[PDB]
Write an enzyme that holds these catalytic residues in place. Structure first.
Site, PDB file in Angstrom:
ATOM      1  N   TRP A  71      44.684  50.973  24.797  1.00  0.00           N
ATOM      2  CA  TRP A  71      44.055  51.838  25.794  1.00  0.00           C
ATOM      3  C   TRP A  71      44.714  53.202  25.947  1.00  0.00           C
ATOM      4  O   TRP A  71      44.078  54.128  26.455  1.00  0.00           O
ATOM      5  CB  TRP A  71      43.852  51.109  27.124  1.00  0.00           C
ATOM      6  CG  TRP A  71      43.241  49.746  26.973  1.00  0.00           C
ATOM      7  CD1 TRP A  71      43.731  48.572  27.463  1.00  0.00           C
ATOM      8  CD2 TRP A  71      42.049  49.407  26.226  1.00  0.00           C
ATOM      9  NE1 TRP A  71      42.871  47.536  27.155  1.00  0.00           N
ATOM     10  CE2 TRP A  71      41.838  48.018  26.387  1.00  0.00           C
ATOM     11  CE3 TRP A  71      41.105  50.156  25.484  1.00  0.00           C
ATOM     12  CZ2 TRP A  71      40.768  47.350  25.775  1.00  0.00           C
ATOM     13  CZ3 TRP A  71      40.024  49.498  24.910  1.00  0.00           C
ATOM     14  CH2 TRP A  71      39.877  48.110  25.036  1.00  0.00           C
TER      15      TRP A  71
ATOM     16  N   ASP B 260      42.063  38.573  37.336  1.00  0.00           N
ATOM     17  CA  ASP B 260      42.605  37.710  36.284  1.00  0.00           C
ATOM     18  C   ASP B 260      43.130  36.372  36.860  1.00  0.00           C
ATOM     19  O   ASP B 260      43.145  36.181  38.082  1.00  0.00           O
ATOM     20  CB  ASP B 260      43.660  38.444  35.418  1.00  0.00           C
ATOM     21  CG  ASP B 260      43.510  38.192  33.911  1.00  0.00           C
ATOM     22  OD1 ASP B 260      43.718  37.038  33.475  1.00  0.00           O
ATOM     23  OD2 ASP B 260      43.241  39.169  33.163  1.00  0.00           O
TER      24      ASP B 260
ATOM     25  N   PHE C  27      37.069  33.401  36.768  1.00  0.00           N
ATOM     26  CA  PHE C  27      35.729  34.019  36.818  1.00  0.00           C
ATOM     27  C   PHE C  27      34.573  33.109  36.406  1.00  0.00           C
ATOM     28  O   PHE C  27      33.422  33.518  36.513  1.00  0.00           O
ATOM     29  CB  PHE C  27      35.665  35.419  36.172  1.00  0.00           C
ATOM     30  CG  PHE C  27      36.207  35.565  34.769  1.00  0.00           C
ATOM     31  CD1 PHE C  27      35.976  34.582  33.805  1.00  0.00           C
ATOM     32  CD2 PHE C  27      36.877  36.716  34.384  1.00  0.00           C
ATOM     33  CE1 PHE C  27      36.428  34.743  32.500  1.00  0.00           C
ATOM     34  CE2 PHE C  27      37.309  36.881  33.074  1.00  0.00           C
ATOM     35  CZ  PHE C  27      37.106  35.884  32.148  1.00  0.00           C
TER      36      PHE C  27
ATOM     37  N   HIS D  65      34.343  38.297  23.471  1.00  0.00           N
ATOM     38  CA  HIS D  65      34.786  37.923  22.126  1.00  0.00           C
ATOM     39  C   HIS D  65      35.682  36.656  22.082  1.00  0.00           C
ATOM     40  O   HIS D  65      35.894  36.124  20.997  1.00  0.00           O
ATOM     41  CB  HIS D  65      35.388  39.127  21.365  1.00  0.00           C
ATOM     42  CG  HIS D  65      36.819  39.450  21.693  1.00  0.00           C
ATOM     43  ND1 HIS D  65      37.665  40.026  20.752  1.00  0.00           N
ATOM     44  CD2 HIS D  65      37.512  39.282  22.844  1.00  0.00           C
ATOM     45  CE1 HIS D  65      38.836  40.173  21.357  1.00  0.00           C
ATOM     46  NE2 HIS D  65      38.793  39.745  22.616  1.00  0.00           N
ATOM     47  N   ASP D  66      36.175  36.161  23.238  1.00  0.00           N
ATOM     48  CA  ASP D  66      37.043  34.976  23.283  1.00  0.00           C
ATOM     49  C   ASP D  66      36.229  33.706  23.332  1.00  0.00           C
ATOM     50  O   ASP D  66      36.770  32.616  23.102  1.00  0.00           O
ATOM     51  CB  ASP D  66      37.916  34.976  24.555  1.00  0.00           C
ATOM     52  CG  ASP D  66      38.931  36.085  24.739  1.00  0.00           C
ATOM     53  OD1 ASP D  66      39.272  36.750  23.739  1.00  0.00           O
ATOM     54  OD2 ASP D  66      39.456  36.229  25.874  1.00  0.00           O
TER      55      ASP D  66
HETATM   56  C1  LIG Z   1      41.483  39.269  25.568  1.00  0.00           C
HETATM   57  S1  LIG Z   1      42.285  39.451  27.068  1.00  0.00           S
HETATM   58  C2  LIG Z   1      41.782  41.167  27.444  1.00  0.00           C
HETATM   59  C3  LIG Z   1      42.611  41.838  28.545  1.00  0.00           C
HETATM   60  C4  LIG Z   1      42.070  43.235  28.730  1.00  0.00           C
HETATM   61  N1  LIG Z   1      40.702  43.262  29.354  1.00  0.00           N
HETATM   62  C5  LIG Z   1      42.169  44.025  27.424  1.00  0.00           C
HETATM   63  O1  LIG Z   1      41.173  44.205  26.699  1.00  0.00           O
HETATM   64  O2  LIG Z   1      43.290  44.482  27.077  1.00  0.00           O
HETATM   65  C6  LIG Z   1      41.210  38.366  28.046  1.00  0.00           C
HETATM   66  C7  LIG Z   1      41.640  38.347  29.512  1.00  0.00           C
HETATM   67  O3  LIG Z   1      40.792  37.385  30.190  1.00  0.00           O
HETATM   68  C8  LIG Z   1      41.692  36.584  31.030  1.00  0.00           C
HETATM   69  N2  LIG Z   1      41.010  35.347  31.386  1.00  0.00           N
HETATM   70  C9  LIG Z   1      40.734  34.300  30.545  1.00  0.00           C
HETATM   71  N3  LIG Z   1      40.109  33.361  31.214  1.00  0.00           N
HETATM   72  C10 LIG Z   1      39.904  33.735  32.510  1.00  0.00           C
HETATM   73  C11 LIG Z   1      39.265  33.137  33.632  1.00  0.00           C
HETATM   74  N4  LIG Z   1      38.652  31.919  33.552  1.00  0.00           N
HETATM   75  N5  LIG Z   1      39.275  33.821  34.777  1.00  0.00           N
HETATM   76  C12 LIG Z   1      39.882  35.055  34.869  1.00  0.00           C
HETATM   77  N6  LIG Z   1      40.460  35.690  33.841  1.00  0.00           N
HETATM   78  C13 LIG Z   1      40.487  35.048  32.645  1.00  0.00           C
HETATM   79  C14 LIG Z   1      43.016  36.436  30.224  1.00  0.00           C
HETATM   80  O4  LIG Z   1      44.077  36.157  31.139  1.00  0.00           O
HETATM   81  C15 LIG Z   1      43.112  37.883  29.626  1.00  0.00           C
HETATM   82  O5  LIG Z   1      43.741  38.817  30.474  1.00  0.00           O
HETATM   83  C1  LIG Z   2      43.739  41.287  15.562  1.00  0.00           C
HETATM   84  C2  LIG Z   2      42.988  41.272  16.894  1.00  0.00           C
HETATM   85  O1  LIG Z   2      42.080  40.393  17.069  1.00  0.00           O
HETATM   86  N1  LIG Z   2      43.347  42.226  17.862  1.00  0.00           N
HETATM   87  C3  LIG Z   2      42.697  42.252  19.193  1.00  0.00           C
HETATM   88  C4  LIG Z   2      43.799  42.104  20.327  1.00  0.00           C
HETATM   89  C5  LIG Z   2      44.226  40.671  20.268  1.00  0.00           C
HETATM   90  C6  LIG Z   2      45.148  40.055  19.460  1.00  0.00           C
HETATM   91  N2  LIG Z   2      45.158  38.675  19.668  1.00  0.00           N
HETATM   92  C7  LIG Z   2      44.190  38.360  20.645  1.00  0.00           C
HETATM   93  C8  LIG Z   2      43.753  37.162  21.240  1.00  0.00           C
HETATM   94  C9  LIG Z   2      42.739  37.185  22.202  1.00  0.00           C
HETATM   95  C10 LIG Z   2      42.148  38.435  22.549  1.00  0.00           C
HETATM   96  O2  LIG Z   2      41.138  38.426  23.433  1.00  0.00           O
HETATM   97  C11 LIG Z   2      42.525  39.664  22.013  1.00  0.00           C
HETATM   98  C12 LIG Z   2      43.559  39.618  21.056  1.00  0.00           C
END
Ligand SMILES: C[S@@+](CC[C@H](N)C(=O)[O-])C[C@H]1O[C@@H](n2cnc3c(N)ncnc32)[C@H](O)[C@@H]1O
Ligand SMILES: CC(=O)NCCc1c[nH]c2ccc(O)cc12
Ligand SMILES: C[S@@+](CC[C@H](N)C(=O)[O-])C[C@H]1O[C@@H](n2cnc3c(N)ncnc32)[C@H](O)[C@@H]1O
Ligand SMILES: CC(=O)NCCc1c[nH]c2ccc(O)cc12
Ligand SMILES: [Zn+2]
Ligand SMILES: [Zn+2]
Lengths: 345, 345
Positions: A164, A210, A235, A253-254
């Site tokens: 970011w 979160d 959420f 994407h997760d």
């Molecule tokens: C891939 S990370 C992305 C964080 C941020 N939005 C970014 O792009 O840098 C996914 C986020 O969703 C959160 N998360 C996963 N499951 C959740 C849930 N059931 N309720 C709230 N947050 C959740 C994880 O803790 C994490 O911070």
């Molecule tokens: C290589 C890649 O996927 N980079 C995106 C950031 C990243 C790395 N590991 C992850 C696992 C879960 C997620 O939501 C984002 C990431």
């Protein structure tokens, strides 16, 4: 990959040797060779770097020499001695003091993703992630495996925030968000994107949402502004904060289509007429055949989460089904793109 | 690495993502996607590849699509369906039937080296290999760790032989070896280089010398010609075969200077006036700063053996100290170069 050999053979070795190059960069970060060079009064010799990072004279030399060949470092000769210095690249992206530092992300990739990827054939065979076979930790609850320990959770939070500092402006300014005075970053992690968002939209306020353990480490490890607030919860089940705009950066994407549809329906049903949803993801070309970086990122979701990367049409299907209208997207020319959809009457 | 971003940022992501690209290639080999395409009556769809390799529809698709982007595969559209086919590159190097196949080497890199490399920071810190920390196997006796199991030994032997199908001719014809009617390949593994050597020099005979378990698996798994003979033993202690030319291909790079000096002294003392020593190694540029592939190979010796890669001057020091004269080298323009030195009176 000898200079006089067939272009195909040379390309094949490039690919084959890729993991060695990745780990030279990860190891340099892990040892803090770039920070020591930035903190130095001038350029350093091999003995100095080796001493300052607590490593081998032979090991250090090889690492520094590969970094020079990779154009991560510059070398100058003084007397009968090589002295190393940082480049524009390493100063801007590989220094912990730099605001555009990509250090934490690189460390996570090498310590976490790299290991998972060693089980790629199996992830491809099974169509599922490899936390159990890699770390011996079950992934039945995805984020219990991703946050293996307090240490792993902090590293993940430090890692993700870094993009970011380079990509944040393009995603938040793709559309004019000044129409949404009250915002919510669903799954906002440490709040880096919300901090970026608040400087761009001074007449706005945001709540970072979160899971409890993330909200705790965010308040405990990351310093705080006057516009940013926190809310802990799940959420998929808890009451979401009231907002005009719900931001979903790297959340969809997760998860698989069904889980995505569930969260999307919840957000829709919480929105009011004119409310919006801002999805920030790396968009896949319509033929799923590029960009290569996005394709690698989708395979990393096969290995690291329960999801995949998606095409604009795919996001449109998901968002339309949830009830959203006025679907629009904007390719930023960066890894991360932006989608905006709205609630009608 | 977005199309519209800074050249440095794009380069940084390339490096960071290298391990993902390496494993896409290793996994494709490990699943045999290239062999199935070569054995097919024409091009195959995703469902066909997935079925033929016992993998996911989602996993397979992603793998095939990345291979297309990496120019390892070609895709054509027929009806509403993508059909995949091999390239010149994959046909020549990624097919088990091809004589220039690089498959086994790639599989070893992904299953063995890749894992070791995950402990690069530690190998750099300690100045030593990581077999114990990676496989839980001690490396006090190097080749007991390298030949962890019967399976690992065969894989190592299949892996190493592959480069000689492309590089063998340049190393054996760099100098005219027809002056040495009787030859010995010290640490010759499966005898691929000796088989290559015998077709080039029809008036010669060669003995492949290796440790008992290697000689056994060579006779047991690799098919045999009329000019090639075997001898099992330890070249650090046992009587060496009588020869006019002793060949040392990728032996010296496994060991430290002292161990190298020991073996070299033994060979020297076994030679007769006019006898020769042919060292086949990837030569490092005099400033140890290239070629990049050779630099990565030296760091792999830090991680996988007890040695390093060396500069021509370094080989000259070692060979001169042992008693050899008339030191000459030839850069082939390939990974592997050739050195020839002789015994005088
Ligand atoms: C891939 S990370 C992305 C964080 C941020 N939005 C970014 O792009 O840098 C996914 C986020 O969703 C959160 N998360 C996963 N499951 C959740 C849930 N059931 N309720 C709230 N947050 C959740 C994880 O803790 C994490 O911070
Ligand atoms: C290589 C890649 O996927 N980079 C995106 C950031 C990243 C790395 N590991 C992850 C696992 C879960 C997620 O939501 C984002 C990431
Ligand atoms: C790096 S491999 C090279 C094989 C082959 N020359 C090539 O380049 O493909 C080193 C070889 O030395 C052998 N070796 C190691 N120690 C040995 C010893 N003490 N005596 C005999 N052979 C040995 C190993 O078994 C292996 O075949
Ligand atoms: C990457 C690399 O070093 N390739 C050379 C062939 C190879 C791979 N692992 C090895 C271990 C010992 C050795 O003597 C050669 C090799
Ligand atoms: Zn509904
Ligand atoms: Zn002597």
């Amino acid at each position: 990959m000898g200079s006089s050999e067939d272009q195909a053979y040379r390309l094949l070795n490039d690919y084959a040797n890729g993991f060695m190059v990745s780990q030279v960069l990860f190891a340099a970060c892990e040892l803090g060779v770039f920070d020591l060079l930035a903190e130095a009064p001038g350029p350093l010799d091999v003995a100095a770097v080796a001493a300052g990072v607590r490593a081998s004279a032979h090991g250090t030399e090889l690492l520094l020499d590969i970094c020079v060949s990779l154009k991560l470092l510059k070398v100058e000769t003084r007397g009968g001695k090589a002295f190393y210095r940082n480049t524009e690249l390493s100063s801007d992206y590989l220094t912990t003091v730099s605001p555009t530092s990509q250090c934490s992300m690189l460390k996570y990739m090498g310590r976490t993703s790299y290991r998972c990827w060693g089980h790629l054939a199996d992830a491809v065979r099974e169509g599922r992630n490899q936390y159990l076979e890699t770390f011996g930790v079950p992934a039945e609850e995805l984020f219990t495996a991703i946050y293996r320990s307090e240490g792993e959770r902090l590293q993940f939070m430090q890692a993700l925030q870094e993009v970011w500092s380079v990509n944040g402006r393009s995603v938040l300014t793709a559309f004019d968000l000044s129409v949404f005075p009250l915002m919510c970053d669903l799954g906002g992690g440490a709040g880096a994107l919300a901090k970026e968002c608040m400087s761009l939209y001074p007449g706005c306020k945001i709540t970072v949402f979160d899971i409890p353990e993330v909200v705790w480490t965010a308040k405990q490890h990351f310093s705080f502004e006057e516009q940013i607030d926190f809310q802990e919860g799940d959420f998929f089940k808890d009451p979401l904060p009231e907002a005009d705009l719900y931001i979903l950066a790297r959340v969809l994407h997760d998860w698989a289509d069904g889980k995505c549809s569930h969260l999307l329906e919840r957000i829709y049903h919480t929105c009011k007429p004119g409310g919006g949803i801002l999805v920030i993801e790396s968009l896949l070309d319509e033929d799923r055949r590029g960009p290569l970086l996005t394709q690698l990122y989708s395979l990393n979701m096969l290995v690291q989460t329960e999801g995949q990367e998606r095409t604009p049409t795919h996001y449109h299907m998901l968002l339309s089904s949830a009830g959203f209208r006025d679907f629009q997207f904007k390719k930023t020319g960066a890894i991360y793109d932006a989608i905006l959809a709205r609630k009608g009457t």
